[PDB]
């Protein structure tokens, strides 16, 4: 589909059998979701945004469906203000910017 | 053009007669550039992202050229780690997300 940007590019994602709303963010290198429970072991990671850095938990090879498109990749979990689908997963679903 | 997301979507912008590198950021509501001098009056504003909020100066009716495309809109100036072209200007150049 083609998504305009007059409003936030929010889409529904499915992870851990649950539906959540997330933002398609080309400005995010990685994907970070609000505090939640994921399986497996996690590794520590620091991600910096416009206001500074936050510590997040890194989970690898996580199944996540974005707008019906299945992706399997690294998902970060931490005190993010909103669920963010970053470039690591945007590339998996073949998302591009056009103008 | 069509921009893939394997790497950060950085483009050259022209503003205030200066050429700068900026990120096409669909996750950013507004456009914020690193400290610089702009004409006209400004209003203080607080913007929040990952890590928290930063104080920026809000300038309105600013003309910017993004990849040859002229756009007009509000531009925020402050301690942002990277120049960000947000939705307020991305819409003006007809930028969309496609997959
Ligand atoms: O932090 C980023 N990437 C980082 C990231 C994100 C997730 C995972 C990994 C990494 C690493 C890096 O790429 C991106 O910034 C460019 C950026 C790029 C590289 C290094 C940086 F330092 C950096 F700032 C990101 O797209 C932010 O722009 C955006 O985050 C999602 C978000 C959305 C809505 C409300 C929020 F509160 C919020 F957070 C955000 O903060 N949006 C806010 C914003 C921005 C400009 C003007 C106004 C407003 C208000 C709101 O829309």
Curated annotation (Swiss-Prot), chains A, B:
Signal peptide: none
Stretches the record annotates as Dimerization of protease: 1-5, 49-55, 88-99
Domain Peptidase A2 residues, every copy: 20-89
Taxonomic superkingdom: Viruses
Active site, UniProt feature: 25 (for protease activity)
Subunit details: Homodimer, whose active site consists of two apposed aspartic acid residues.
Annotated function: Aspartyl protease that mediates proteolytic cleavages of Gag and Gag-Pol polyproteins during or shortly after the release of the virion from the plasma membrane. Cleavages take place as an ordered, step-wise cascade to yield mature proteins. This process is called maturation. Displays maximal activity during the budding process just prior to particle release from the cell. Also cleaves Nef and Vif, probably concomitantly with viral structural proteins on maturation of virus particles. Hydrolyzes host EIF4GI and PABP1 in order to shut off the capped cellular mRNA translation.
UniProt name for this protein: Protease
Natural source organism: Human immunodeficiency virus type 1 group M subtype B (isolate BH10) (HIV-1)
Name of encoding gene: gag-pol
Segment of the intact protein contained: 501 to 599 of 1447
